[model samples]
Target: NDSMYGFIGTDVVLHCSFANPLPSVKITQVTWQKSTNGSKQNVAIYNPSMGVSVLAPYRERVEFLRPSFTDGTIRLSRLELEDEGVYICEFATFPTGNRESQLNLTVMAKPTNWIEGTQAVLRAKKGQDDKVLVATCTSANGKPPSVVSWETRLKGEAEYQEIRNPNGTVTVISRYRLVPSREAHQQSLACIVNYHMDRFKESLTLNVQYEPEVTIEGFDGNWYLQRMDVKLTCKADANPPATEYHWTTLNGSLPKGVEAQNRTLFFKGPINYSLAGTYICEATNPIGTRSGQVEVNIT
Candidate 1:
């Protein structure tokens, strides 16, 4: 056996042996040859009675492991780019037949770049103000899909549920509930998906829409003030997050002094009659926004 055709510095092994018995006739000559149609070259050779002769091209790069006069076993070392192509081993026997074998070599390379996909929804609940959820998977389509992970993103993460697909796919769904005291009817919610699950992840934005239950809460209850402390509470619920939430007084201008806490407003003192008009509060998020207004009839 001789040449193992492949890239430069790639290791290869050439195998050559006969199916018949070893000791059939005299071992007059053993030669490894390379032919390119136009010319023929000798890679290595041995003569039982004369001695060994290796061509200059493959002298130091080839070796004979068990060069017995009866058996033919040779080994080549440190193959280079130049060492490639088909090689044949010829044996000179008395009234004997010739046998040979071929070897195919290849050099595997590294991956070009990493790939991943965005997180998306797989399932959800039913009925009014039903919350929506989404899940995501990364590098799900790699040559070896066996090596993927999600535990890194799930650690200490809240309400993160993972779902596996039959087609070697995955998802993570997040859920939220809608209540009557909130007006999330015409609001918008969003979902984000990142692939490759690495520090550098790609993101996708999705909007959630829902028909919310009708309910209103604000400054309409038994609430009054005159140089006194007071609190204004607002409420609204939807499948998605809120879009916007703010406060404003009557006369189409913002109130003089107002503060918010836990989606509620706090006010104190010398509340003027002019402050008895409409006090508006709004709420919003990635999905949609809604607002509620209440009038404070000053004494």
Candidate 2:
């Protein structure tokens, strides 16, 4: 089969040679042509006495590698995606009549963008009983296939597979999966593609969404008569952020002069007994909500 492989954006030589039939048979001319879509088109021409001629479209891109009576090899420089086709080399001699040969060139190429399916934000329920699927990175539609790998701080695995295209190109796909964690939030996962000694990569910043893991700080767990004041700070870890905050007592309601604003609760007092009890701070977001509790016992 006259099939050959060529890399895209590179140079290739379509070889064609003919030996003189007899001592008297003199090589006169050689013509190079390409066929596509059921039609033949001129590429380059070489004549011993008339010199070399490359026709339009291929005039500036085609060259005669070794112009001789028996050699008709021509080089195509700076090949493009559309250059994959069948090339015909026609040779004419004084006494030998005409001869021709064909070379089938298959141009290999990589995808415009190697990485696909990278997510900007990954949402998972906090303290989820089951493993949450974070994201999947893919590399596909590349020639010669490709070796795909994943790099992340989380524990995961990458599954790879190859597919054959109808146009004779090979496609490679790598899928990645992971369970979300609070530590993995705001971290980056990278997808890498290795092909033909070249490497390409893309990175995704993780935004693992989940219900708030709430915490209450700044409260010493007890309030003295006139020693320290009361101000409890509430914080939560979540994606899309917590929009609203509420403060309530588990047994009763907030104190008479105490105020709750944003994520903080202010006790306007000299550390009194009315503030002694269990208080709950509820943080709510679009996905879900969470609450944290702190106890303040009077001295």
Candidate 3:
């Protein structure tokens, strides 16, 4: 609660005031110093008799907000990651210069939060690319390193990578991984970032590739010797969809009377006894192929 937060490239005030309990005690000057690694560096000074003087390196960036004898409040501008740490304000009095208060400043930066999906498609049910890198979430170039997590119903794990930039900012990456399964097809995945009290969220719908699940329909159980306009249709379920469809029979290919379309088999003429044989429908895509069969019974 005592810790203070400041955004990079902004300004903040370190308030320091002295109360004279003894009425006779008088104020003279105040000095500000920065503390790092158990050491102190003089930053600025304010004297009632003189004026305000900041260190050469911080002359333009640090100044006295209220230079009065009782107040040593100093403002720092254009903050940087290195500017974070402890600041000591020493109040100079007529007798004791030992009175000082230390304030802690923590610098922060907003993360470039984003998510990236895998270049290659994820396949379902132990495909050739079984366990693969599904997606990546990043919180990049943030002071004090951001925390990244995933929101998903998939049973998966994540690999965390932390990078420290030259400018003292940290980048966090979360690689989401899982074995591609039917249960994970077309599911949702979200990324969450925690930088201070604010939460950043990003999400993507998972795309899991799978081979076609084929089913042949259209042929009724009551197909007679001359049933007109009878045909067979191929139905398939798959990711990336079944791009190609083919029709065939267990015997000498398809007869001239049977018309084969992309997914529909049209027996344009009346159904004949020769069409009673089992017809096979094949569906395929980049993933793989599947076939469904139906026997056209001629009563």
Candidate 4:
């Protein structure tokens, strides 16, 4: 006979049945109690011989369905959030021994919409980290507030630099900064909240705007160029730095046997005529990215 935990505003059915075969194996009484101060208070009870008796708090709200020797069931109506506690079921069987079972009822309350007043200020450098701007979001307000999430419409990635109150609802100050190009400047940012238990749902969008700039720097050049090579150099720079890069003149990588002073990149080259075209460079940090093309004509 095991009793399971139940959420608030939901129904809970407690099972207390055992094997007992005898002439008068009747459930003389059934009691529901809350264990407080190592003591139990009677909530509801049933009698097989007499009628039924319910505690003051549960007088007219309790229903005893079965009182015969066959079934003994007790139902509690309108379970309140404060009605969460422990309960016991006692049974008397003549010459068959006595039996009893215990139950613990748990109530899960739904979270509510944490108002804007409870929001925390979010911060980051504007032009350098274009994806996110100074903003605010809500968190732990009431008992079980709903789930909260922050999102943006830009294509690049977004990361949290720091979290003020990572746990319960205090001042959930958070920061997201990502290098983005001009194309990703006008994207939308939003904070969403969901109240559990089918209560309600709400979200707020922030109109964030910022100047695009390069964030990181890198050098790029080809390999396999002739001795007197007129190679091309590809530079990646941005407030946040572009996330993508490509050389259009060549399909894959440069030919073999080619070398440059900047052996690691485009410092040297074979000065070949075939390497004549635009060198496309792209940089992306988070939530935004940009692309620029430069033509390299080798003699």
Highest TM-score scorer: 3
How good is model 4 by TM-score? Answer: 0.48
Q: Please provide, for model 1 over 69-135, each residue's C-alpha lDDT reduced to its tens digit, 9 standing for 90 to 100.
A: 5445566666553454456677766657555554433222211222222243322224435433332
User: Per-candidate TM vs. native?
Assistant: 0.41, 0.64, 0.84, 0.48
* Per-residue C-alpha lDDT of model 4 across residues 157-220, encoded as one tens digit per residue: 4232222333322232233344434444345555555554453333343333322342212323
* Residue 80 alpha-carbon offset, candidate 3, angstroms: 1.3
Q: What's the distance in Å from true for residue 168, model 4?
A: 13
Error of 1 at 257 (Å): 3.1
RMSD of 4: 12.6
Per-residue error at 53 for model 1, in Å? 3.9
lDDT of 1 at 124: 22
Which 10-residue span in candidate 4 carries the lowest summed lDDT?
A: 115-124
Give all candidates' CA lDDT scores.
0.49, 0.77, 0.84, 0.49
Name the lDDT value of residue 40 in candidate 1: 64
Model 2: residue 165 alpha-carbon error in angstroms: 2.3
List residue ranges in candidate 3 displaced over 4 A: 21-23, 121-129, 164-168, 181-185, 206-209, 219-227, 238-243, 250-256, 269-277, 295-299
